[PDB]
Amino acid sequence: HRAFSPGLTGVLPLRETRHLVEVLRARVGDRFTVFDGEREALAEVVDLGPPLRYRVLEERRPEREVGVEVVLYVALLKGDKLAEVVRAATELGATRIQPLVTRHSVPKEMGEGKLRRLRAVALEAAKQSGRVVVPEVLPPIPLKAVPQVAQGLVAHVGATARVREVLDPEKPLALAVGPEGGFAEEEVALLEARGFTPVSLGRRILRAETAALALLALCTAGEGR
Amino acid sequence: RPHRAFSPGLTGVLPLRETRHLVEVLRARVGDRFTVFDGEREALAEVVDLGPPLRYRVLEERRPEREVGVEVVLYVALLKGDKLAEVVRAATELGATRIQPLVTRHSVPKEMGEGKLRRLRAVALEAAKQSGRVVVPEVLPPIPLKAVPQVAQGLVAHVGATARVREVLDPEKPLALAVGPEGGFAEEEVALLEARGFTPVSLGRRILRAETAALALLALCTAGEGR
């Protein structure tokens, strides 16, 4: 259990106390995690209060990973937009980025130099986002080469389901995003066959980069992970 | 018995999936009226043949709904360079109706010239067109953080927060979102925002650039909610 405690003073705020002593039931001696954004640490229940008291046993570095694999299958884009996507996707917790060649993608391949550069962007973004895990960026693959997945999401204009209504937070995650031209219906068809669930991204037309980041943000940062 | 079916290009013929759903599930019949759409256009249609695939004729063209449906105001700290242009563009495609730059304790720039304001307005205009919107987000000159008004509903990303946007959002009320600079909102600035009516929400375990936090916070409230 992670309980918010301003400054890790040893005493837990009123709300926090009720939340774990009544709703989660917490006895004395039980160990739990304390945090206030600035810090995090293991602590022990000393007094059940209220307000509940505790003692700091050990400070520790906050975990930064989402918790499950988050693979982003994203089509090759125009300009240097793929570099920005890789940077934000890394901040958003992706663990793997798989560029794709698709019917409407303009580029149909990617040199070694470009790939190396994208890997440098990921390395840098990982550091700045506090991650120790650097997302893997791979050589492009054709769309029909995308694998069968346990859980996948693809934004589609016809979809009505929201990401929060289909997402299983303990299952690995695969997200598919098409190029500026979008995925062709036959492609969306193959994606669904592969296990990708179509979801809604709203009423407006989004740039491919934005759709990619919004889908990701809905699954990671938005879920508080 | 209204229903809207996805029909790429509004060509008069529905995809097999939509056909089966209308015919098999909704019990559609020749003469019935329904809505067809494809992200670009929309229209009232009338069933001409169940096929399959189902064929229909367009009765009248209609404008796709593009707005979130309530006011969406982004209160964002001044950022260096073209960062704000990027924020404005993404905010526009994400449904913002108003963008209010803020001078904050840690915001690098403390003012904005007419040239930047005009540029931001040009970006809003353009982005509105590219996202299919008729409405163009208003972009205001900067104001001190203290000038932020009391809000009916507000959310601010905060490291120590635990509530997720989806656990707090009220789709029926106008929405205010606050995003600090790279240096982030100071302790007393977050307190001030809560005083104004902003609820702290969590954006996860990783450090995010101001631009990305803004995109994420908006996406969780509009696009992500199917709005």
Side-chain angles (χ1 to χ4, degrees):
Chain A
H1 296 297
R2 295 169 59 68
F4 176 63
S5 188
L8 316 178
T9 65
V11 54
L12 201 64
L14 183 55
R15 177 189 293 188
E16 288 57 54
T17 298
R18 304 173 179 174
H19 168 56
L20 84 181
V21 175
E22 302 181 301
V23 180
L24 296 177
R25 307 161 186 173
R27 285 181 167 64
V28 177
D30 291 302
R31 294 187 172 183
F32 72 93
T33 297
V34 291
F35 72 84
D36 50 52
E38 307 294 300
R39 304 143 59 192
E40 180 187 308
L42 179 65
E44 188 177 65
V45 180
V46 176
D47 192 303
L48 303 184
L52 177 155
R53 288 185 179 287
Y54 67 78
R55 181 172 66 77
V56 181
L57 307 190
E58 186 173 321
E59 305 187 79
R60 59 187 196 184
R61 284 163 295 185
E63 289 297 300
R64 305 281 191 177
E65 296 306 290
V66 173
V68 302
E69 275 304 293
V70 180
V71 189
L72 174 69
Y73 296 85
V74 54
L76 292 170
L77 305 173
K78 292 166 178 173
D80 187 54
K81 296 185 279 189
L82 195 57
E84 59 187 58
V85 171
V86 167
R87 178 180 283 78
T90 298
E91 301 182 85
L92 288 167
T95 56
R96 178 170 303 177
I97 294 169
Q98 178 63 63
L100 301 163
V101 175
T102 79
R103 190 189 184 194
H104 303 306
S105 72
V106 173
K108 300 296 184 188
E109 53 192 300
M110 172 177 272
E112 183 170 60
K114 281 187 179 180
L115 186 60
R116 187 193 195 73
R117 175 172 167 286
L118 294 179
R119 289 173 173 161
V121 166
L123 186 61
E124 176 62 47
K127 319 311 164 180
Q128 305 204 309
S129 60
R131 300 181 63 180
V132 168
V133 175
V134 182
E136 162 182 300
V137 183
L138 303 168
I141 61 176
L143 171 84
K144 47 195 62 177
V146 171
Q148 192 70 36
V149 301
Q151 180 189 212
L153 309 176
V154 56
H156 192 286
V157 177
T160 58
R162 303 173 173 105
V163 171
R164 65 179 168 78
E165 301 171 326
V166 310
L167 180 67
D168 180 342
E170 58 177 281
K171 209 140 296 186
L173 185 71
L175 305 171
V177 181
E180 297 83 346
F183 281 129
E185 289 301 290
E186 54 265 40
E187 294 184 302
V188 172
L190 178 51
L191 258 7
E192 292 190 47
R194 290 291 114 80
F196 284 80
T197 298
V199 295
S200 172
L201 279 193
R203 302 164 177 159
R204 300 153 296 286
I205 300 177
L206 302 170
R207 285 172 291 164
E209 316 93 278
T210 309
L213 305 178
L215 250 189
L216 246 186
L218 297 171
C219 302
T220 63
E223 280 305 315
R225 22 141 65 160
Chain B
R1 186 231 157 185
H3 185 64
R4 35 195 296 116
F6 179 67
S7 187
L10 305 194
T11 68
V13 52
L14 285 179
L16 292 176
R17 183 154 70 199
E18 280 63 18
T19 295
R20 176 162 61 190
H21 186 77
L22 198 46
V23 174
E24 261 182 51
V25 172
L26 304 185
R27 289 189 163 305
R29 296 277 191 285
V30 172
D32 288 349
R33 295 184 174 184
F34 66 109
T35 293
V36 289
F37 71 101
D38 71 356
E40 279 297 316
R41 302 150 56 209
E42 190 165 304
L44 178 67
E46 180 170 302
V47 180
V48 152
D49 192 324
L50 298 180
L54 185 149
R55 299 183 170 265
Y56 61 87
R57 72 183 179 86
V58 181
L59 297 181
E60 59 172 292
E61 288 289 296
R62 290 177 173 176
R63 300 290 185 176
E65 261 162 56
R66 297 296 186 193
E67 296 307 287
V68 173
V70 297
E71 282 292 305
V72 179
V73 185
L74 175 61
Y75 290 97
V76 58
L78 292 174
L79 300 180
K80 186 172 171 182
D82 310 310
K83 294 187 183 184
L84 285 180
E86 305 175 298
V87 167
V88 172
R89 184 174 298 281
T92 299
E93 62 185 333
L94 288 172
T97 56
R98 180 179 311 294
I99 300 162
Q100 178 62 80
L102 305 175
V103 183
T104 79
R105 186 176 180 184
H106 301 300
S107 71
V108 182
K110 305 298 180 176
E111 63 193 312
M112 178 184 287
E114 176 67 16
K116 170 151 283 174
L117 180 62
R118 291 152 86 105
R119 173 51 178 164
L120 297 187
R121 288 174 171 166
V123 166
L125 182 59
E126 176 179 290
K129 276 143 63 175
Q130 297 184 350
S131 67
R133 299 178 70 186
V134 164
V135 177
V136 182
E138 274 183 54
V139 183
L140 305 158
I143 68 182
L145 175 61
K146 60 77 180 305
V148 168
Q150 289 295 144
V151 303
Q153 174 179 218
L155 306 172
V156 58
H158 183 62
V159 187
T162 54
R164 305 179 178 87
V165 169
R166 69 178 169 73
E167 296 167 325
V168 179
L169 184 67
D170 184 329
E172 290 191 67
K173 290 179 173 178
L175 184 63
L177 302 175
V179 180
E182 308 91 330
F185 280 134
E187 179 192 59
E188 62 285 336
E189 289 184 313
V190 170
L192 178 157
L193 288 172
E194 287 180 279
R196 298 294 188 289
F198 292 71
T199 295
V201 297
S202 173
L203 285 188
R205 305 161 182 154
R206 294 156 303 285
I207 303 175
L208 309 178
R209 282 173 295 169
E211 312 97 293
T212 308
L215 181 165
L217 188 61
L218 275 162
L220 300 173
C221 296
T222 61
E225 280 295 317
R227 305 207 279 176

